[PDB]
Amino acid sequence: VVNVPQFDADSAYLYVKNQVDFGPRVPNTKEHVACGNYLAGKLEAFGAKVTNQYADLIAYDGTLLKARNIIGSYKPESKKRIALFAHWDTRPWADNDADEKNHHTPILGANDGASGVGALLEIARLVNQQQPELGIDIIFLDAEDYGTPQFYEGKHKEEAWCLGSQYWSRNPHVQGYNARFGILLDMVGGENSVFLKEGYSEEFAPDINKKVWKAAKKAGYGKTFIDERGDTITDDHLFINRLARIKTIDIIPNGFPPTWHTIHDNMDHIDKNTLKAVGQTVLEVIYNEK
Ligand SMILES: [Zn+2]
Secondary structure (H helix, E strand, O other), X not given: XXXXXXXXXXXXXXXXXXXXXXXXXXXXXXXXXXHHHHHHHHHHHOOOEEEEEXXXXXXXXXXXXXXXXXXXXXXXXXXXXXXXXXXXXXXXOOOOOOOHHHOOOOOOOHHHHHHHHHHHHHHHHHXXXXXXXXXXEEEEEOOOOOOOOOXXXXXXXXXXXXXXXXXXXXXXXXXXXXXXXXXXXXXXXXXXXXXXXOHHHHHHOHHHHHHHHHHHHHOOOOOOEEEEXXXXXXOHHHHHHHHHOOOEEEEOEOOOOOOOOOOOOOHHHEOHHHXXXXXXXXXXXXXXXX
């Protein structure tokens, strides 16, 4: 039996906190620039071959976003690969806040942004120390969360979201890129979260959902990964499935956590035990692929 490393939730939690400590990671801000440098630096320290994808992405309102997708690759020559995704930007508006006064205020995005990234940094650390059989790509996607605000009077186009993933899906970081499958982590740090099988994931990658939920159960996380269909959610994996044609699932809580797109999406609501359940399940999956 392959040795599956132990996900260190304390370290993952640190990596979440480190991102949040920059402040909001809103595209076109200095805090976003600084955190991108931190993330690329950490991947490089953890033995990844780092590729940066800088792109001028146009937001719903015409704003040019100076975006940066960050890719860290392990065993880059291997043609048998697994892609692991998380968005790293944070939403510029707390547009679901209970107080209307807060609807134009940027969120810290501890869960929505930092959590997936922090879990994947811990996975990168472990992959470097003991390489799985398959090549692993860690892909931090920018400009996911700049989609039309709720307070905007006008069209709310689906494609206003997930700008970095649309770009990456149309413009792979290496010519002829392919992966066997992908896993997207979105909001994987919240206290008490549970995860159901997401709808587009079921549509495009049902065998990958089966693989992940079976691994979760075997790893002791069957109360966190509930074997039931949940909601259909627009997220980066929709665009990866449609445009890149890589079978990709989303690990995302079931509605959204109460902190979503509020000013309360901060470290107070992050529980390292949620990070552990999700992270350990991902390790179980990627190390057992042949
Ligand atoms: Zn969000």
